[PDB]
């Protein structure tokens, strides 16, 4: 599922600016 | 037509009242923009309590009044190393000039030999990010309550020729009444036409920020689309393992929606997450009204939101003043003030 892909992406925590 | 005479007359009057309000708001802002406030306190007026986030923001307590505040501490030498001088001075200048119920209020500011200090009201409910990740996703009425406050805030900021460029749940706090507070202006810029800076967070970047072409205030309306999507789905519309892969998806613009999204919501999001700037809501002849008048916002009373007379869907638990239980914990580095003044010339205006 899309959610599982999100979990697998590793970008589920706080995101830094570039 | 969609509106009879009565509803048509009412909407037209409301939209003229917005213009009247923004004209006065801009005159007020420009007065403080031209003549800013400085050095309205000093360090030993506060006891440092706990780090709220990471420079670094700390819960402090005013010794005289006992009031609690959130004090942002910037290391002057670090800001120079990161080429952040202009960003820091501009953030303070913006925060001392704006005034809106959903924008964090700067109560004091000052500097010493090593550091710059911005002392803001304490927003005790923690980040939206925390509550979103905690309950997974917001129901559409819940998401809309927050979204309406962002729409009004961007309408206000854009009238002052300010582009925000830093929207995301990590940068939105919840206050004791359940309303939103916007805090981070390190990436905001006052600019009337186009600008070019590559800045922001990958998931939230508009296509035209990624690509070399110039861009304008409409990037904020793209970012609102991303925020509303993430609030209602629990994850953002474009993600991947690495930012480069995220950008590729953003520029393609092929967006897919969870099956529980309403048709109204999908229609709004397709018009906000629109790669074609000639078609993106918030960028057309009708401006913000295309958003505010969209069916997904039909139940939204914009005045009542502004007046904070709508009951919030979530009220943070507050176990008393100075309670930080809605924030994560961070390691506590002691604040060190040098014998010698650092980078004095660069930070004269603070
Ligand atoms: O929560 S903060 O430390 C914070 C900042 C400014 C004012 C604040 C007021 N109250 C609590 C926390 C506050 N924060 C810093 C990192 C960026 N994301 C959210 C803002």
Distance (Å, whole) CA B202 – CA B239: 9
Distance (Å, whole) CA B150 – CA B102: 8
Pairing of strands B68-75, B56-62: antiparallel
Residue B50: closest CA among B316, B337, B323, B336? B323
The resolution of the experimental structure, rounded to one decimal in Å, is 1.9
- Beta carbons of A18 and B198 less than 8 Å apart: yes
- Beta carbons of A11 and B168 less than 8 Å apart: no
| B5-34 and B85-97 helices, crossing angle to 10° | 120
Q: What is chain B's Cα-based Rg? A: 21
B12 annotated to bind ligand: no
Q: How far lies B50's CA from each of B2, B85, B183, in Å?
A: 54, 26, 18
- Give backbone dihedrals phi and psi of B114, rounded to 5 degrees, phi first: -110, -30
Chain-centroid distance, C-alpha B259: 29
B72 annotated to bind ligand: yes
As beta bridge partners, residue B50 has B59
Q: What is the number of other CB atoms lying within 10 angstroms of the CB of residue B324? A: 17
Show the tokens assigned to B276. 């074609």
| Domains of chain B, first to last | 18-35+127-317 (1.10.510.10), 36-126+318-348 (3.30.200.20)
Burial (CB count within 10 angstroms: exposed 0-12, middle 13-18, buried 19+), residue B345: exposed
Across the interface, which of A3, A6, A17 has its CB nearest the CB of B200?
A17
Whether A2 and chain B come into contact, CB under 8 Å, resolves to yes
Q: Which helix (H) or strand (E) holds B220?
A: helix B218-233
- Beta carbons of B256 and A2 less than 8 Å apart: yes
Cβ pair B294, B281 in contact under 8 A = yes
Show the tokens assigned to B187. 């990436």
| DSSP single-letter state for residue B137 | S
> What size, in residues, is chain A?
18
Q: State the Cα torsion B133-B139-B145-B146 to the nearest 10°.
A: 20
Distance (Å, whole) CA B213 – CA B275: 13
Show the tokens assigned to B329. 């914990």
Distance (Å, whole) CA B328 – CA B184: 18
Q: How far lies B23's CA from each of B30, B93, B134, B203, in Å?
A: 11, 20, 40, 34
Distance (Å, whole) CA B197 – CA B62: 38
Tell me the helices (H) and strands (E) count for chain B, helix number first: 11, 9
B243 annotated to bind ligand: no
Distance (Å, whole) CA B164 – CA B216: 11
Instruction: Give exposure, B202-233, as e/b (b: 16+ Cβ within 10 Å).
Output: bbbbbbbbbeeeebbbbbbbbbbbbbbbbbbb
Experimental technique behind these coordinates? X-ray
Cβ pair B220, B164 in contact under 8 A = yes
Distance (Å, whole) CA B67 – CA B121: 9
Ligand 1 pocket: which of B54, B57, B68 to mutate (most atoms within 8 A of CB): B57
Show the tokens assigned to B14. 């409301």
Handedness of CA B271, B274, B279, B285 (dihedral sign): positive
Q: Where are the beta strands (DSSP E) in A1-18?
A: none
Show the tokens assigned to B346. 């660069």
Whether A15 and chain B come into contact, CB under 8 Å, resolves to yes
Distance (Å, whole) CA B245 – CA B287: 32
Q: What is the number of other CB atoms lying within 10 angstroms of the CB of residue B43? A: 17
Across the interface, which of B202, B235, B256 has its CB nearest the CB of A6?
B235
Q: What is the number of other CB atoms lying within 10 angstroms of the CB of residue B308? A: 14
């Amino acid at each position: 599922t899309t959610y599982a892909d999100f979990i697998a992406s590793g970008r589920t925590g706080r995101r830094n600016a570039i | 037509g969609h509106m009879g005479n009565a509803a048509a007359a009412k909407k037209g009057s409301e939209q003229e009242s917005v213009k009247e309000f923004l004209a006065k708001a801009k005159e007020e802002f420009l007065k403080k923009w031209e003549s800013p406030s400085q050095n309205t306190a000093q360090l030993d007026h506060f006891d440092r309590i706990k780090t709220l986030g990471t420079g670094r923001v700390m819960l402090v307590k005013h010794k005289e009044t006992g009031n609690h505040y959130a004090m942002k501490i910037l290391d002057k030498q670090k800001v120079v190393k990161l080429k952040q001088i202009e960003h820091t001075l501009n953030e303070k200048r913006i925060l001392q000039a704006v005034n809106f119920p959903f924008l964090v209020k700067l109560e004091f500011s000052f500097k010493d030999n090593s550091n710059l200090y911005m002392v803001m009201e304490y927003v005790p409910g923690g980040e939206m990010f925390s509550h979103l990740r905690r309950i997974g996703r917001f129901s559409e009425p819940h998401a809309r309550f927050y979204a309406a406050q962002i729409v009004l805030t961007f309408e206000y900021l854009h009238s002052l020729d300010l582009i925000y460029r830093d929207l995301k749940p990590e940068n939105l706090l919840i206050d004791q009444q359940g309303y939103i507070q916007v805090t981070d202006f390190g990436f905001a810029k006052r600019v009337k036409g186009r600008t070019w800076t590559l800045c922001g967070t990958p998931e939230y970047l508009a296509p035209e920020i990624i690509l070399s072409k110039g861009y304008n205030k409409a990037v904020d309306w793209w970012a609102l689309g991303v925020l509303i999507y993430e609030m209602a789905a629990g994850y953002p519309p474009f993600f991947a393992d690495q930012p480069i892969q995220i950008y590729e998806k953003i520029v393609s613009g092929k967006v897919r929606f969870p099956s529980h999204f309403s048709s109204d919501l999908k229609d709004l999001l397709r018009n906000l997450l629109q790669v074609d700037l000639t078609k993106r809501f918030g960028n057309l002849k009708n401006g913000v009204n295309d958003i505010k008048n969209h069916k997904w916002f039909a139940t939204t009373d914009w005045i009542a939101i502004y007046q904070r007379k709508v009951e919030a869907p979530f009220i943070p638990k507050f176990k008393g003043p100075g309670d930080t239980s809605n924030f994560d914990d961070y390691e506590e580095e002691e604040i060190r003030v040098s014998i010698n003044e650092k980078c004095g010339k660069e930070f004269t205006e603070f």
